[PDB]
Amino acid sequence: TGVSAEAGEQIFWGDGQCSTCHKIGSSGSATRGPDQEGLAERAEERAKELGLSSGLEYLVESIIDPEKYVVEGFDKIMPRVYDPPIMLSREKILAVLAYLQSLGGEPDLDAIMKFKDKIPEASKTKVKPWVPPLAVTAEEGEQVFFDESLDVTCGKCHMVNGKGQKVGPELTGIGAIQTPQYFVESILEPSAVIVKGYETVFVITADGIPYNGLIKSDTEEELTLILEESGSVEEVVIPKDEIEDMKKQEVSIMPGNIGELLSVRQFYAVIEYLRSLK
Numbered sequence: 236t237g238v239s240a241e242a243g244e245q246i247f248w249g250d251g252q253c254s255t256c257h258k259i260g261s262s263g264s265a266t267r268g269p270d271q272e273g274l275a276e277r278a279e280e281r282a283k284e285l286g287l288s289s290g291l292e293y294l295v296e297s298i299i300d301p302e303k304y305v306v307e308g309f310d311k312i313m314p315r316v317y318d319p320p321i322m323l324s325r326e327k328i329l330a331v332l333a334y335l336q337s338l339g340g341e342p343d344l345d346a347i348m349k350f351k352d353k354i355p356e357a358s359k360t361k362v363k364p365w366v367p368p369l370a371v372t373a374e375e376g377e378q379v380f381f382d383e384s385l386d387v388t389c390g391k392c393h394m395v396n397g398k399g400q401k402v403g404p405e406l407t408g409i410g411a412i413q414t415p416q417y418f419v420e421s422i423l424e425p426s427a428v429i430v431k432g433y434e435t436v437f438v439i440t441a442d443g444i445p446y447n448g449l450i451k452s453d454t455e456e457e458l459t460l461i462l463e464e465s466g467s468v469e470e471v472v473i474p475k476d477e478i479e480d481m482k483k484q485e486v487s488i489m490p491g492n493i494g495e496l497l498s499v500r501q502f503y504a505v506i507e508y509l510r511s512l513k
């Protein structure tokens with residue numbers, strides 16, 4: 236579809252997967268990454284703060300090296316879209332850059348094209364194929380994911396295609412977005428990266444009762460928390476009028492010892508299942 240902001244718009248809201256994490260004002264609803272309304276202008280300020288030549292160069296760096304600068308309030312979750320699974324082509328990345336420039340600025344085709352030699356080509360990815368050290372299948376991993384007899388059951392907290400229970404983020408489609416390495420880290424180091432909005436809050440009530448958990452819903456009268464203990468969850472409804480203090484914490488309620496609770500085979504099977512969620 237060429238290199239234009241119009242082509243980039245289709246890619247941002249399509250095969251680039253950008254809109255699975257980013258919204259643009261009232262367009263879209265994803266909150267995993269920052270709202271990109273006004274991105275063109277704040278890229279200019281990012282560039283000045285980071286010593287880059289231009290806002291456009293900051294946009295390029297944000298795609299090719301997402302870890303290099305981490306926007307305040309977020310964790311290192313953005314994938315390299317030129318790598319698997321997304322495998323976004325170089326022309327499509329150039330198009331996306333034109334679209335990003337149109338978010339409060341002017342697309343500059345000549346300037347974008349000069350960064351072509353900095354964009355890795357998806358077909359030339361250096362990522363090695365993912366080969367588990369045992370024969371496992373996605374179907375085997377699906378069974379593990381929903382197995383209530385294990386000491387951890389992913390389906391107690393994660394929904395996939397309408398099955399499971401909504402505590403953490405729905406995992407439908409995540410295999411089209413994230414890497415196996417991200418799945419490994421998410422399972423074995425769950426608080427290393429916290430999906431935005433799924434932070435644990437520490438609550439103290441006026442009667443001095445502590446409640447530590449994930450906010451399920453936040454209304455004018457009531458705060459509903461999900462508390463976790465040893466892989467089990469429970470809800471508490473706390474009247475807003477009784478809340479003395481609330482502090483967000485950079486920790487996840489996803490159990491921190493899953494490496495002790497899954498076998499090698501169950502672990503690699505569940506990763507194959509996640510990879511398969513396209």
Ligand code: HEC
Pocket residue numbers: 247251252253254255256257267268269274277281294297298301302304305306309310311312313314316331335412
């Ligand atoms: C689809 C190809 C895209 C594009 C064009 C962008 N993203 Fe993301 N992104 C995500 C998170 C958590 C952050 C903040 C942490 C960090 O800086 O890495 C970002 C950041 C950006 C930026 C910089 C924004 C700024 O305000 O400075 C830009 C330009 C950007 N992204 C573009 C999260 C995600 C995803 C979650 C898994 C996905 C998918 C994408 N981003 C995809 C894209």
Ligand code: HEC
Pocket residue numbers: 312380387388389390391392393402403404409417418421422425426428429430433434449463466467468487488489490493505509
């Ligand atoms: C069973 C072994 C699993 C597997 C395979 C996953 N989970 Fe969880 N998870 C929970 C919460 C609150 C979050 C968000 C906060 C955080 O980032 O830790 C997550 C996150 C994930 C991810 C990342 C998802 C993404 O969109 O990037 C993945 C891949 C993941 N989990 C896999 C909560 C829970 C639980 C509540 C007690 C339980 C049990 C699990 N998760 C179990 C699993």
Ligand SMILES: [Ca+2]
Pocket residue numbers: 297300301302303304305306313
């Ligand atoms: Ca970044």
Ligand SMILES: [Ca+2]
Pocket residue numbers: 421424425426427428429430487
């Ligand atoms: Ca995590």
Ligand SMILES: [Ca+2]
Pocket residue numbers: 469
């Ligand atoms: Ca209890």
